[model samples]
Target: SQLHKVAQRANRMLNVLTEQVQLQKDELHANEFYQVYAKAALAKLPLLTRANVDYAVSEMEEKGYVFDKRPAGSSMKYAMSIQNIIDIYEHRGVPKYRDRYSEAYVIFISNLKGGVSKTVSTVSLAHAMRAHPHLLMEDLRILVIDLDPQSSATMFLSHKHSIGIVNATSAQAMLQNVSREELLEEFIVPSVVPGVDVMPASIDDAFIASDWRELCNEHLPGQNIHAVLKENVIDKLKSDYDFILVDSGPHLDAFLKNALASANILFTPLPPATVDFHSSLKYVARLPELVKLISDEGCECQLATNIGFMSKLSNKADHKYCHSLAKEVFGGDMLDVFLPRLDGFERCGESFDTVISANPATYVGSADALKNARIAAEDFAKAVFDRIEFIRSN
Candidate 1:
């Protein structure tokens, strides 16, 4: 009886940000936009001189994307949106979509261990991929399905006006006898990141593993229980997006099995610290068994690319052994770019702004700190893109 609400605080912050940070899609006017994120989108383009950006802005304005005129006496330039940036790139003849693949590439971010920055990494990677300059794409779409009942990703992505108010979440959508379109329209909500949509979770979702398994035994006992999400939910909608990222953090066998079975790629984030490092090496051994467990269920689970990436990196000499050992142990299986232990990460999560989206003065508190972290995020994005392209090329 002593507890407070789980999501109201975060929901209220989201409400304020929609009004103040200019996150709404149909937002108009130069002053209405979140300056830092808008500028990051503008900055992500290559060779956009002041004259060049404005020159293109006029065409975007004429074409129907509404950017309010910069006040003549003010220093502000053209108002920018993420889509506007994509339009600018298209106007410049830059190709935005890829067609080598028939379905959205699914990347599963998983580790048996907790506190490895899984949810933050997932949300940040989604935003950073869009906010990176060289990797920018027009009409890029991302779906983050928060399978974790902790609902960290849910709070980071959608309010659902608090999970109590919105009953249809990832678990509910899959468990109930809902249509594919109903599953999508009712369950998925737009995230603060321009191109991202989230299938949020609630505390009730913790029972998903057991309930899904029980439901399978009752209805489709002989069928592959692990394949329900892939066949019923994701398969119906994969054609509409560029990428689908599944963020799951739990020990529940059913949840992990479903994601593992569906993954085109797997990324395990390992921090080079005493506990996190120890837990990661153990996980690699356990990983094969988890995949085989899914394989035993009748469907062969294949990953085009499966690897680990460093997170919460440190420069101290004491942690150096873990770094060197990580390379030696997971050689050619680790991403070169790792997230730093920056204060920006925590603050951004609380405020609903990423290091890529939040300006230094308002959110990060240090320009140099934000710049370094943002650059790392950019590198991380490019590295993931490189791996995905590697699969595509082969």
Candidate 2:
């Protein structure tokens, strides 16, 4: 997993730092370079400290560049400083945001908590819409914004082959605020899927959020939010997309707020568990209040239903659990589609492939579970389209 790689790289970088501190000497120029390098690396890798940096420093020191301030300080040999390595790596073209798709339906799969079916919903919804009859167009584009910073949505869309987001010059400026046409120049990546694409986020997404908050606070007064994403990101681009889905992080932060402000319909996916049911209700309970809050400002949303359903669930016991929750919790108002837990779905994600193509006729044959997953997905989209129709009519 990327998390493991991040941890390992962070650890190795720290070990190289500590050895430099203890051996500081009058080989002043090299020592200065070493000092600055360690400082900068530490700034990025706070989780790494004494052991990792120290270990690497000892190895580098042995190779040469011994900063001995003793009487023989004047006599020295030049060695490759860790700072030089850090500098090279820093400029080695890290993954960046780029604008690839100019026109498309944008969607963010988001929820207040993990395991709320955010990523799954994003993938399934894109698939459902891609296969829709009425959605056909000269170029019916679909994009998944992987706002969770976990890259799950990105992986599902791109198959982990590209493994990064779009990097562009003018497009990067829009993270602050840019015109609608400028948005087409922002961060984006082509997806492996036919009609879909993604804007993948990494661990850096969290760090970027802090910068976004600082800017938002500096620019806007009081409780004004969504400055970057809504005001700048979506202002002139609303008509450009047929649909926009935002797959957000579990935590309630700027990213999530921006997603809510821009979304036409919000999908609240449930897991059909007792504890999770409470979590779903917590958000559901707040939806009306949120709608009212925004409506007061003339931006009231039409949250059509407080629907919930269990996903990734099957088996006698789990089915029984889902049945109880469906009737007693979600009731008849909930859609008929239920996302069934199927091995095929899991396999597709792991192998970075979709069931539709990989095992086409396999599940399409007579798999009851796959059929259920598809039906539930269609209903969900239909639910959103119903809202869209209402919005257009009124």
Best by lDDT: 1
* TM values, all candidates: 0.83, 0.60
> Residues 193-300, candidate 2, lDDT per residue (tens digit)?
454556566655766666765655665444355534555655465565555667777877667766766665555676656676667667766766665665675344
How close is each model in CA RMSD to the real structure?
5.9, 20.6
Residue 276 deviation, candidate 2, in Å?
A: 2.1
- Can you tell me which runs of candidate 1 are displaced by over 4 Å? 1-44, 47-55, 62-65, 72-76, 159-164, 219-222, 350-353, 357-364
Q: Ten-residue segment with the worst summed lDDT in candidate 1?
A: 24-33
Candidate 1 on 113-152: residue-level lDDT in tens? 8888888888888877765666655457788888888878
Please report the TM-score between candidate 2 and the true structure: 0.60
Q: Supply every candidate's count of residue pairs whose N, Cα or C atoms clash at under 3 angstroms.
A: 0, 31
Off by over 4 Å in 2: 1-110, 133-139, 163-174, 218-223, 289-306, 315-318, 321-324, 327-333, 352-394
lDDT of 2: 0.53
